[PDB]
Amino acid sequence: AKAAFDSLQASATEYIGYAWAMVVVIVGATIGIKLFKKF
Incomplete structure (x- = not known):
């Protein structure tokens, strides 16, 4: 779940x-x- 959260935060932040x-x-x-x- 932590790994998924990482990607999430990135999605919210990271443009791509x-x-x-x-x-x-x-x-x-x-x-x-x-x-x-x-x-």
Whole structure:
């Protein structure tokens, strides 16, 4: 959980971390979950 928290904080801070957490989180989740939904 600590490792996950590290990435989190980075996302909130780090530009790529945050954006990535969003853009990626959206892609992964959206694409992964949402992606698997449509395709």
